[PDB]
Design a protein around this ligand. Structure first.
Ligand SMILES: NC(=O)c1ccc[n+]([C@@H]2O[C@H](COP(=O)([O-])OP(=O)(O)OC[C@H]3O[C@@H](n4cnc5c(N)ncnc54)[C@H](OP(=O)(O)O)[C@@H]3O)[C@@H](O)[C@H]2O)c1
Lengths: 188, 676, 94
């Protein structure tokens, strides 16, 4: 095991990382779990606030895609959010980054490359996040235990969908209160 | 007290502290009260605690009791609860707060506050007890259908376990409701409740048995209780009277079988349950027991029975072919270069459009630089649209992208850049509902013509494929005939003929003989790809139950090696010939292997063995062909045919060959004349 | 602790409560400190309690400790004493 200081969006730091991987044990797979939150309403979100959130998600994913063409990855996994699919309010830039990631897996599967985007629900185990947990609960998302979250990672490895949504939903609580989003209408 | 311990003294705030440890193993009924998938403590439980601790320290009446956020009961080792009693003020009144924190949690994690209220002295001398003889049920009360009530609560979200299901009869009488409740199981232990929180909640259940609440079909819990005096002691069966106190408040008066007033609530107010206020208890899964694997499903709409129309205003880069589709239906009111021009034209008397369309252009390079541009431009535009004054703002803002999503479960290409805008608006739709729409189009000009129909569909996001509108829906993943195969639970498995004689019968089946120990001369391969011969189709067909093994060839990475084998070691990329390679694990003979050339894909590698070995074995070892000889190759555009032509050109062979006249381009490209 | 019991939890003020029962029969020395005819608890006694309970809940140093009025020790069955520990503020102080 190695731990490396590397901003995955710094195309020179990542290239300097990959070049320093042993030749007898070449890279064969990637699990992308870099992420940054910086929340603000549409009328309030700034330019740097956008750049700051896309940088780990979109800017990094693209570098991993272009710096590894000389290697055929057996797995290439992208962590997204289910707020990209549902549209969690006050998180426009976060949704844009994670929506780019979802598509960038569909964009690799089209080319014949391994890829999967996982639009995660909410995990059981922080101020920028303590604001989001509030907004994912307001929409009926419930926390996924640590083991159960991993089990979905495992089982999703067996399914040939470029985009998959491991999530736990309190569908009854939205039907009760009448706040059912259109996307969820068939789960009642 | 069955739950609380001794009162712990408090000099600073002045007063007492009643501790209590909560656990389902200690009190199995603590979980048998649950709403919408969350096992929680009923509000009725906080009342028992208050009337008991309050009678002891003078303030036996509750002036007001407020509930802030419910306390969920998880699995064994539930959380401890503490009640605080305030000091006696100038009038004898004492404050109250209730708090809970997860069992064993650290001193640095804080406590959640669940209840606060105010207690007062009250004398029971005034109206101690009633008369034992008034006709109860009152004359003219309508019997209430109690049959199967517990199934009817469940359907709405009142998930009540064996301990609270005790409403056995009831009657409605105009404003008021009369009902009898009784604990399903009496409590046999000498630490007993005066009135079980289960029996009180059963009384609370009887509110939803009348018409006290709006017909909004949503679930309601106790939120605030005012003027609660309890007099008697030891009541397991009750007779409850409920009248409306005010317009939005009800008064509850329950007696024993003999008419002795046990408790009276001067006013209870219920309030709908925030969905926010839940954490999974997993009693009886009303949704998602432990979580599930979902995927979006684009499902095509039926062709609309009639032409649909809106007023349309196209603002910006008019993709060629788009305006033609909108104008067919007669909905195109104006083309404009930007929003600023539209705003002026309409103030100058142009048509107020139902829909303002914003054509997002494809072709952006898939890189960080163009994403910021696409986002920040949409961000600036949205902010411009919300500042639009007048009736023009009421129009829907339609972002019309090109292949920004994956409609079909195939290899559908996508534009990740546009899908970044798609996500920005995705959040914007929630912040400002009804303001924006997303409609994605393929490269078919026919789809531009379905765009009116798309916007005859109040869905917020939409996609059009070949002039057919699709709407997205999240869906729990499940196996499906007529769809992709699902590999078994094992790590090792392969593709195998089902024996029914059909391609539907192909199935991914466990393959233990791959995992098995190796004999000499063998290796085990973590297969990455495998080739397919036309013979492997014929095996999939044919109705004999015993069929040959599918697969002949492949490439992958070695995992184990027999001790006699040299020249291959764990970790080496290899291609070769082996049976049953249509799965992630295969055993192979080391003789029939080769190292994968630098720079090949596993697919390129796995394609080669069958075709070139057959063509090499035949040209060189069977026919012993020499330079200058002539060769005929039937089906030269096929698999083994192409391979034969490539070797034959290297061996100095004059090649003639046949193929379908449409494949002659493939032969003339392998270096053959129209005379050949 | 020879005098104090277990820390009793407090959600409202936030923090802990250390109870203790005082008695000359339990601790004969509690009376052997007296000034001008009054057997009392020395200020030195309140310091021990503070450094012990304080080390356990993070704040092992006393910035300031003020004594308002002495506690007299009468004959057998002396009075109970309670110590309260505050919640940790923005700087860790209690
Ligand atoms: N392990 C094995 O058993 C093994 C090993 C080596 C080879 N093979 C055989 O080699 C082939 C490999 O499969 P593949 O994917 O590469 O397919 P393919 O052979 O490349 O394509 C089929 C060819 O067969 C011709 N053909 C034969 N009968 C025909 C008919 N009635 N009508 C039209 N065309 C006919 C076609 O002529 P046109 O050119 O005019 O289209 C076409 O070129 C299989 O047939 C396989 O049985 C099997």
């Amino acid at each position: 095991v190695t731990v490396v200081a590397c901003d995955a969006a710094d195309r020179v730091a990542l290239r300097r990382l990959l070049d320093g991987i042993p030749a007898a044990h070449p890279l064969t797979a990637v699990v992308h779990a870099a992420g940054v939150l910086d929340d603000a309403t549409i009328t309030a979100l700034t330019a740097g606030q956008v750049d700051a959130v896309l940088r780990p998600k979109a800017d990094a994913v693209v570098n991993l895609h272009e710096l590894t063409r000389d290697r055929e990855l057996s797995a290439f996994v992208l962590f997204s959010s289910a707020a990209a699919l549902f549209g969690s309010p006050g998180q426009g830039n976060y949704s844009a980054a994670n929506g780019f990631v979802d598509a960038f897996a569909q964009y690799r599967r089209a080319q014949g490359l391994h890829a999967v985007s996982l639009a995660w629900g909410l995990w059981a185990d922080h101020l920028d996040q303590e604001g989001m947990r509030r907004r994912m609960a307001r929409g009926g998302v419930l926390p996924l235990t640590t083991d159960q979250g991993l089990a979905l990672f495992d089982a999703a490895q067996l399914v040939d969908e470029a985009l998959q949504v491991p999530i736990r939903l309190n569908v009854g609580a939205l039907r009760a209160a009448g706040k059912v989003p259109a996307l969820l209408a068939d789960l009642v | 007290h069955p739950l609380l311990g001794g009162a712990v003294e408090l000099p600073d705030r002045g007063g007492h502290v009643y501790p209590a440890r909560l656990g389902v193993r200690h009190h199995p009924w603590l979980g048998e009260h649950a709403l919408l998938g969350a096992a929680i403590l009923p509000g009725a439980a906080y009342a028992e605690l208050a009337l008991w601790a309050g009678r002891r320290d003078g303030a036996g009446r509750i002036e007001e009791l407020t509930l802030d956020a419910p306390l969920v009961v998880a699995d064994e080792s539930a959380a401890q609860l503490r009640l605080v009693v305030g000091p006696a003020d100038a009038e004898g009144r004492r404050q109250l707060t209730v708090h809970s924190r997860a069992d064993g949690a650290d001193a640095d994690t804080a406590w959640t506050r669940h209840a606060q209220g105010t207690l007062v002295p009250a004398d029971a001398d005034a109206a101690w007890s009633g008369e034992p003889g008034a006709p109860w049920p009152p004359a003219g009360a309508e019997p209430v259908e109690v049959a199967g009530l517990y199934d009817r609560f469940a359907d709405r979200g009142y998930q009540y376990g064996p301990s609270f299901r005790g409403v056995r009869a009831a009657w409605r009488a105009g404003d008021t409701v009369y009902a009898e409740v009784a604990l399903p199981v009496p409590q046999p232990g000498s630490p007993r409740f005066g009135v079980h929180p289960a029996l009180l909640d059963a009384a609370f259940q009887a509110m939803s048995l009348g018409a006290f609440f709006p017909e909004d079909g949503q679930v309601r819990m106790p939120f605030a209780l005012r003027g609660v005096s309890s007099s008697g002691v030891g009541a397991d069966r009750l007779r409850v009277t409920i009248s409306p106190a005010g317009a939005e408040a009800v008064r509850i008066a329950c007696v024993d079988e003999r008419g002795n007033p046990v408790v009276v609530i001067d006013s209870l107010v219920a309030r709908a349950v925030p969905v926010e206020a839940l954490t999974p208890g997993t009693p009886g899964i009303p949704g998602a027991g432990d979580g599930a694997l979902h995927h979006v499903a684009w499902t095509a709409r039926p062709e609309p029975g009639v032409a649909a129309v809106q007023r349309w205003a196209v603002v910006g880069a008019a993709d060629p072919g788009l305006a033609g589709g909108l104008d067919r239906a007669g909905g195109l009111c104006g083309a404009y270069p930007d929003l600023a021009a539209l705003v002026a034209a309409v103030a100058e008397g142009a048509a107020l459009p139902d829909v303002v369309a914003v054509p997002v252009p494809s072709g952006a390079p898939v890189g960080p630089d163009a994403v910021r541009a696409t986002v920040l431009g949409a961000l600036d535009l949205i902010r411009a649209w919300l500042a639009v004054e007048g009736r023009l703002g009421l129009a829907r803002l339609a972002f019309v992208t090109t292949s920004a999503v994956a409609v079909g479960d195939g290899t559908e290409h996508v534009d990740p850049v546009s899908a970044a805008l798609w996500g920005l608006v995705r959040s914007a739709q929630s912040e400002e509902p009804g303001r924006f729409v997303l409609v994605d189009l393929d490269a078919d000009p026919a789809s531009a013509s379905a765009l009116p129909a798309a916007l005859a569909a109040r869905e917020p996001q939409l996609a059009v494929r070949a002039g057919a509108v699709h709407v997205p829906r999240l869906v729990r993943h499940r196996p499906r005939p007529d769809g992709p195969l699902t590999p078994p639970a094992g790590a090792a498995w392969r593709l195998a003929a089902g024996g029914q004689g059909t391609l539907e019968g192909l199935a991914l089946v466990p393959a233990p003989d791959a995992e098995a120990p190796l004999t000499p001369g063998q290796v085990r391969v973590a297969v990455r790809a495998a080739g397919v011969n036309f013979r492997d189709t014929l095996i999939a067909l044919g109705m004999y139950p015993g069929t040959p093994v599918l697969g002949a060839e492949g490439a992958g990475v070695i995992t184990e090696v027999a001790p006699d084998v040299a020249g291959f070691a764990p970790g080496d990329r290899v291609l070769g010939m082996w049976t049953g390679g249509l799965g992630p694990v295969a055993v192979a003979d080391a003789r029939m292997l080769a190292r994968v050339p630098r720079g090949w894909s596993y697919a390129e590698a796995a394609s080669v063995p069958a075709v070139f070995l057959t063509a090499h074995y035949a040209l060189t070892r069977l026919a012993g062909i020499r330079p200058g000889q002539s060769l005929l190759v039937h089906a030269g555009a096929g698999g083994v045919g192409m391979a034969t032509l490539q070797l034959a050109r290297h061996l100095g062979v004059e090649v003639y060959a046949t193929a379908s006249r449409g494949k002659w381009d493939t032969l003339r490209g392998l270096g053959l004349d129209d005379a050949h």
